């Protein structure tokens, strides 16, 4: 179903924040070198 | 350089930002079925 | 630990292939329009 | 153009290769810890 295409391309921005928050958690971590 | 961590764990940050906005645009589009 | 550096960008990998796959599983769903 | 799917959703297979290679050589750096 193109609501399928909603729920699939939200589980998108969903882990492409989870990218935004590992690749946050990347930079303060490599702050700590 | 532990820097580079930073700046490339910055463009994680940048690209995973830009995964949020086109997969919005994926659910809008995917919105407009 | 620098390890851990390892199973995290292994972890990159596996999910960055599950990127490939559903973005691969995108152009077939999106060829069956 | 559900085509515009196919090419939109190469450039998340290309992207999310670049995801493989750039989180591989993540991988071999934090080898070298």
Request: charged share 60%; proline share 0%.
């Amino acid at each position: 179903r193109x609501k399928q295409x909603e729920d699939k391309x939200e589980e998108x921005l969903s882990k492409x924040y989870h990218x935004e928050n590992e690749x946050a958690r990347x930079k303060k971590l490599x702050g700590e070198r």
